[PDB]
């Protein structure tokens, strides 16, 4: 019910995993930080064997057409910035943030661009309310990903 996923580095050291197909390329990143360290924003996945496409964060391994045993290269790169959608009750906005950076720090963006008072904005990432003191990293936001506003006034 599981297939066999091997993450290979440059020079052949390599992890081994049995995953399910409805985990997302974003969830596997984290699998590889919890054994070598690396962030999951500086890591690049990508096929070894590849009928060919790029590998999307959001979206599962079967949502790519893997549902069976693969095989992936690792490339590890350099601290660099991303990109959240901030979407509000009518429309969406893009921030250029770094994953090290708090809530407070995104909500002063926010404040900044869309003129809504920090203390008046509920941030929410995957259902779940986010705190002005935690980095996004803590919650594993992922680049380009969705960041849900809700003004709350009192």
């Given at each position: 019910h599981m297939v ?16 399910h197909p ?133």
């Amino acid at each position: 019910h599981m297939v066999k996923v091997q993450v290979k580095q440059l020079q052949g050291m390599s992890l081994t995993r049995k995953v399910h197909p409805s985990t997302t390329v974003w969830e596997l990143k984290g699998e590889i930080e919890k054994e070598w360290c690396i962030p999951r924003y500086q890591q690049r996945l990508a096929l070894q064997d590849n009928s060919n496409p790029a590998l999307r964060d959001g979206d599962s391994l079967a949502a790519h057409g893997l549902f069976y045993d693969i095989v992936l290269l690792l490339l590890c790169t350099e601290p660099q910035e991303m990109e959240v959608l901030v979407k509000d009750s009518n429309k969406t906005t893009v921030y250029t943030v770094r994953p090290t950076d708090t809530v407070k720090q995104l909500k002063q963006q926010i404040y900044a661009c869309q003129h809504v008072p920090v203390e008046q904005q509920r941030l929410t990432y995957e259902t779940k309310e986010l705190e002005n003191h935690h980095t996004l990293e803590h919650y594993h936001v992922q680049p380009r990903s969705t960041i849900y506003l809700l003004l709350r006034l009192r």
